[PDB]
Amino acid sequence: MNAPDRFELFILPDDVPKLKITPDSRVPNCIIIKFEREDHTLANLLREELALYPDVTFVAYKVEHPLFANFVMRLQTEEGTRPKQALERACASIINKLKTLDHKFNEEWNIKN
């Protein structure tokens, strides 16, 4: 009766952006990212990567409430780099890693069969 639709979990409505960014005033060079229609599948992956970089001071996130499919990510890199640059760097690095993995697996399967 009051059940939420299953198609609302991933199909982002137009009025709200997929990603929303805000600054964190309490400390410098810190921003808060409000994601949408996402869950641990992406947040955890991004966090693990961003934590490995040396120039990133604080990276964190939390799935506020499971009944709502979105999460917020707090990121603060040292003054050297603006957080957004680190974020896009992490995205690119992960994409490259995945492409390499796909190539290797394709080779392995081909020789296997």
3-state helix, strand, coil in the chain (%, to 5): 40, 20, 40
Residues 82-111, mask of contacts with another protein (x by CB under 8 A): --x--xx--xx-xx-xxxxxx-xxx-xx--
Element (H, E) at 97: helix 83-112
Q: Are 60 and 47 in contact (CB under 8 A)?
A: yes
Tokens read off for 44:
């955890």
For residue 17, state whether it binds another protein (rule: CB under 8 A).
yes
Query: Tokens 């020789």 belong to which residue?
Result: 111
CA distance 8 to 68: 10
x/- contact string, 29-48, with another protein (CB under 8 A)? ----------xxxx-xx-xx
Annotate each residue in 46-85 with x if it binds another protein (CB under 8 A) or - if it does not, as one string: -xxx-xx-x--xxxxxx-xxxx------x---x-----x-
Q: How long, in residues, is the chain?
A: 113
Shortest Å, Cβ 60 to another protein: 4
Q: Could you list the residues that contact another protein (CB under 8 A)?
A: 1-7, 9-11, 17-19, 21, 24, 26-27, 39-42, 44-45, 47-49, 51-52, 54, 57-62, 64-67, 74, 78, 84, 87-88, 91-92, 94-95, 97-102, 104-106, 108-109, 112-113
